Design a protein around this nucleic acid. Sequence first.
RNA 1: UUUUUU
Lengths: 239, 210, 210, 148, 37, 244, 287
Amino acid sequence: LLSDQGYRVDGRRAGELRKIQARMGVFAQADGSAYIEQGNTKALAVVYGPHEIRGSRARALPDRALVNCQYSSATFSTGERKRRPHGDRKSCEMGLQLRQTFEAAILTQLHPRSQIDIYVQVLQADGGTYAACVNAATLAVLDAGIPMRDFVCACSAGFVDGTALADLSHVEEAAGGPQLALALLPASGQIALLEMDARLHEDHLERVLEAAAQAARDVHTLLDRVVRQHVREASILLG
Amino acid sequence: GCSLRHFACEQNLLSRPDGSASFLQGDTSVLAGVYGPAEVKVSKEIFNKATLEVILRPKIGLPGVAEKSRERLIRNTCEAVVLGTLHPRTSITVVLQVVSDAGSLLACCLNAACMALVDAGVPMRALFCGVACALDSDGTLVLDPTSKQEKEARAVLTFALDSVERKLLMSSTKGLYSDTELQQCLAAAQAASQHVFRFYRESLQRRYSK
Amino acid sequence: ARAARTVLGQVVLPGEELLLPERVRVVCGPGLRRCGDRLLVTKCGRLRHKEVYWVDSQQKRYVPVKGDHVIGIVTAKSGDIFKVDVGGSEPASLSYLSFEGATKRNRPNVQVGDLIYGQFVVANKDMEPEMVCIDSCGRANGMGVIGQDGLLFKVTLGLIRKLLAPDCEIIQEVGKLYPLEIVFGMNGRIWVKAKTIQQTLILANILEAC
Amino acid sequence: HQPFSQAVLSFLPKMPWSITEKDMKNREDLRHLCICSVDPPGCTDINDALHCRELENGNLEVGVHIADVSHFIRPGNALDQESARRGTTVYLCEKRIDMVPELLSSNLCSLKCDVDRLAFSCIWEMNHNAEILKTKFTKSVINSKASL
Amino acid sequence: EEQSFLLCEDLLYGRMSFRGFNPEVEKLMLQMNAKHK
Amino acid sequence: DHRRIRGPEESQPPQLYAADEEEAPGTRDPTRLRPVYARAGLLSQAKGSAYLEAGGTKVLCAVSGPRQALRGRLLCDFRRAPFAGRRRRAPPGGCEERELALALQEALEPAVRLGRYPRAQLEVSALLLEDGGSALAAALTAAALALADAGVEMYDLVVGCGLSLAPGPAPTWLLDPTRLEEERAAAGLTVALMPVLNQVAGLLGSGEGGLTESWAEAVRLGLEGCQRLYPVLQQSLVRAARRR
Amino acid sequence: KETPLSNCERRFLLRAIEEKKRLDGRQTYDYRNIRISFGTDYGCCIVELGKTRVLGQVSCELVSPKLNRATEGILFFNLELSQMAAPAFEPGRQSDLLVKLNRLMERCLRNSKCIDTESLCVVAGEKVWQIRVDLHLLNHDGNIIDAASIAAIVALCHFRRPDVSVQGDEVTLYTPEERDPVPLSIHHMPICVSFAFFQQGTYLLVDPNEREERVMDGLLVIAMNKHREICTIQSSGGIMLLKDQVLRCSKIAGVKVAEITELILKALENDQKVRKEGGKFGFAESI
RNA sequence: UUUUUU
C-alpha cells in the first residue's frame, strides 16, 4: 500500500515535499560548508574553493577550471554495514554525475588553472540520496562564493496507480519501481540532469516529468529563503 | 597418417588497430589486434630494443595466473622473431581475445599473432607457427587435438616452430611423456609446420589480388 | 638458379633469402635489409625493381623517414620550438624561425591545433625527428599553414603510393568533374576543400572508398 | 516427451544408407517373394508384413515378417537407454510421441514400398486345413511389393 | 641501405590542385610537372 | 586475488579441533635471557643484511640502498612468513603487519640520521620466519644490524627486548618470553633503546591489567635487559666487518 | 596518447551539422547497417553496429544464493574494454568511461526486469543458477552503449542452460550430451538508443561515430521496449535541455526499438533454421 | 485396467 484515498505512507499528498532544513557555514576550518536534511536523510557538503593544483600538475586545463567530486557514504547508513573501500562502483558513478552537474553551471570560465573540489558525505540515507547530495553541494558552493549560473535544485518523483508522487522515501523506492530524479536550474527551465530506472510506459512520461520539475521548483522556493535569511544576518553584523 | 583440421584466416577486420588477424582453426577461434610502433612511458625506455607487450584475455572470467604465463611465452616467442633492434624507444602492443575455445589455444594464438604482426608491418626476420600433438594411453599421436582428444590423452604438447630452418622456438607441456615420444612429436610438428607455412603464403597471395 | 632476382613481380614471404649477382653494389629499399651477400625480407609485399629493389605493404602506421611531405598537427608550444604530432613514434619539433621570412621581430602565426605541411630534415632511429617548412635554397614552395575549412581524413599508405604515381586514374576524373583542391601527406593523411560541403563529402568518400 | 538428446543421435546409422550385405551373414534373401502390408491410413512407421503361398504337395507356406529394430540398437547403449526409459509409444489425438527417433522409425525400419530392409521372420508349413507341422525362425532381408 | 620511398620508385608533386579551382596552386603544380619533365 | 593460485574457499586450523590439554611451562628465573645467534652480511644481492636467531625465534632483514629542508624518508615493510605460527595468515595480511610496520618506522628514525640523504629513500624489509617469542623486538634488532652493515649513517644501534606478564595472583614480570608464555599471558610489553645515548626509541605494549608502578618497573627492567643484551650484537657485527 | 582532433575538423563538422548532413551520407535519423553473427557454442554473439564489433558471452554456474534473496538467481555483468579497441584504452587509465558504461548496462538489464530471475531457483536457499555475462569491446568507432545493449540482449536470447532435475533433495544435473539444454525465460527485449546534442540542444542527432562524439557536447541514452515502454534514461556531458526535446525524443526511440526488435527476431529465426539442417553459425540480417 | 494394427 502506497497511496490510497489520496494519502501516502508518510501522511502527505502527492505534491508536497518533505520538511527540509539547510544550515550554512558549519566548518569554519574549510572554505564552504553546508548541512542539509530532507526528512531523515542527512547530507553534509564541504568545498575547499579555487585552490591551485597541489600535485600531478599535468591535469590542469589552460582555459577553464577543473571540478573534482567525490561521493562517500557512511558505513553505518542503512541496517547492513557496507564498506566504501572495495565497494567503489556505485560511488564512482555518483561522483561522476556530480562532476557533470557542477561542470554544467559553475562558470569554470572565470578560473583558469583552478581546481574546485566538492566533497559530499551522507550521514543517514532515507531515500532520495542523489537530490539531497546535489542540494547540499549547491548550498556549500554558494557558501564559498564561486560564481555560478543559477541556484541548482534536485528532486525525485515516482508513478503509482495513475498518480505522480514527489520526493520519495526509502519505502517508496523499495517496492515501487519507477524512480525519476532530476536536477534543475529554474531561471531558464533547463533540466540539468535526468536519472530514471523503471518500467514506465511512454504515455505517462510527460506527466511525471512535470510533477518532478514542479517538486524541484518547490525546493527552489524554500532554500532561497534560507539563503536570503543567512545573507541578511550577515550584513547586519557588517554595516 | 597425420593431418590438421580445417584452416581459415582473415586479415584487416578491425579499423582502429594497426593490424588485425582472425584465425579459425576447426572450431576454435582467436582474434589478434596489434598496435604498431608507438609511444612508450619513460619507465620502459630500452635504448637497444623495442618493448613488446602481450595481453591475453579469455572470454569467460577475468584473466589469471596461467594466462600471464602464456602471454609471457607469447612475448618471448615474438621478441625472438621480431627484429626489434630496428625500432628503438617504441612500444608494440599485441592484444589477443579468445573468441572460441575448442582446444589447443596456444597454436591458434601464435598463428593469429604471426598474421597480425605480418599485416601490421612490423619488420621480422622470419615467420612462425604453432601446432600441438596429443599422446594417448597407447602412444598414437594426433596433431591438433579436439577438446575430447585433449581430455582423454595422457600428454599434450604445444610447439611453436620457425620458418627458416624449422627449429624449435617455444614448447609447452601437460603430460608425462618420454624422450622418444618427444622426438616423434617434434618430427610430426615439423611436417605440420610445412603445411601451415604453405597456408601462410597462399593467403598472402589471396590478399594482393588488386 | 633459384631465389636471387627471378621473382621480380611476385609476392614474397618475410624471411625468404634472396641475393644479387656479380665492384658494383646496389641500394636496398625500405623492406629489405642486408645480410652478408644476401638480402633479408622483413615484410609481406610484391617485389618491384627500378634502375633498387623495394617491397610495398598496405600498412597504417607511419615510420619517420627522412625527407617526406607530411601533414602534422600542432600539439603545444614551448618557447622557441613547438611540437607537432605526425602519427609516428614520437612527436617532432619545429622552430618558428624555420618558416618563410621570420626572425625574432616577426613571429609566424601558428595556433595550437592547426595542421601544417612540411618535410623532415633529420629522421633516424637515434633521436627524435625534426621537420621544417622551407626549401633547401631558403623559400617556401607552398609549405606552412594550410588554413581552415577543409575536411581532413586518414587513409592507408598504399593508397597514397598508388595515387601519386604519374600514371593515375582517379585524380584526373575528379579534376574533370568540378573545382576543388587537395593536399596529400606521406604519413597517410588527406586534406580536401571544395566550394560547397556536399561536393567535399562526395570527394572524401570517393577518395577513401578505394 | 522431451526431444532426443544429442548423444543418442550419434548412435544412429548414417543417413545416406543402403543395404549392406556384410551385416547379412546369417540372413537369407527373399526379394522374389510377394509380401504386402495393410495399415490404418496415414502412418510413418509400419512393422507388419505377410505372405501366403501354395506349395507343390498341397501344403501352404505362410510368412509373418517383422521389422528388426534389434539389428540397430545394441544393449548398453544410450539409444537403448532412451528406449528403456520410454518403453512404449504414447498416442494422442493431434500428434504422437514415438519411442524411436523419427529417422529410424520413419525410414530405416518402416517397411516402405519396393525397397529392401532387414527383417526377422517366421515361416509356417501349414496345411489347407491350416494346422501346422513345422515352424521356422530366421533373419532375412525383405522387399515388400505393396502397402495397403 | 635507405628506407626512403620517394627516391626509390617515383612520386608526383607537392600540394596537387585541380579545376584551376584555387590559383597559386596551379602554378606550383606546373612547376612540379616541369621538375618531373 | 587473481594474481595468486586460488584453492579451497574456507580452511580451518587443526589445533582448534585438536583435543588436548597443553600444560603451562612452569616457573623460571625472571631475568633469564635466551641465547642469541646473530650474523650480518649473509645475503649477497642486498646491500646489507642480517640474520637473528634466539631460541625458537628467527628473523631476517635486508636493506635496499639509497635511490633517487629536503630529508630522507625510510619506508619500512614488514611481512611475516605465512607459515610462522599455528594459524596460517593470508599472504598479503593487511591488518597486523601495517601495525607492526609503524612500530618499526617510529623506532628507526631516531637511529638513522637523515640530513646526509637529500631526496633519497631507504627500504628496510623485515621477514619473520618463526614466531617463537618476542616478535617485534627481534625484528627491530635485526633491522638495526642490517642497516648498520648496509653502511648508512646512524647515531647508535637499536636494541629491543619484549616483556610479558604471567597472569597469576602475584603478577611477576617475565623477560623475553616464548610463544607459549605469550599464549598464557595477560599483558605483553616491548621496548627498544639506543644504549649509548641512553634514550628510549620506541615502546609498544598491549595491556590486560596493571597499575602505574608495575608498568614503570617493566620499562626499567626492559632497559636493563637491552643494556645487558648489547655486547653479543657488538661482537657479531665486528666479526661481520672482519669478513669484509 | 590518442591523436587530437584538428580545429578545422571541428569547424567543418559543425558546419556540416548546421545543414543536416552527416559524414557518411545517411540522414539524421538512421542507424548504421547492423550485423548479428553467432559463435559455435551457445551464447556467443558478435554484433557489428558498423565498423564497431562487440563480443558477447554468457556463462552460468551453480552458486549458493544471497541470504536476503533466497528464491531467485543472480545476474552478474562485466563490460571490459579490451586493449585493441582504442589506443588510449590502457588498463586502469580509463576508469570513468568504464564505470559510466558498466553502471548503465547493469541498471538497464537488471532493474528493467528483462530476463526472469524467479525461473532460475533450483532449491531455495541451497542451489540456484547464477548467470554471468561478459561483453568485450573490440573496435571503437561509435556508441558502445547501443552495441553493448544489442549484444547483451542477443546473447541472453541465444543462451541455453543445462537441465537439472530436482527429486526431493537430490539435485541431478546432466551433461549437454545427456540432455538438450533448455532456452532461458525472457519477458521482453529492452534496448538502448543514443542521442547526440550539439551546441546547446539546437541540433538532434542519432548514433554518433568517433569524430561525431569528439565534436559533440551532449549525450543522452533512452532505453525502450517492444511494447513501447521506457526502461532507463541517462544524460551525460554537462548539457542543459528543455523537456520538449526529450518528449519528442521518446517517439523516435520507440520507432528505433521496434525496428531493431524486428532485426533480432529475424536473426534468431535464421540461426535456428541454419542449425536445424547440419549445424553452423547463423549469420543475420545486416539491414 | 484384456486384445490386434496405428
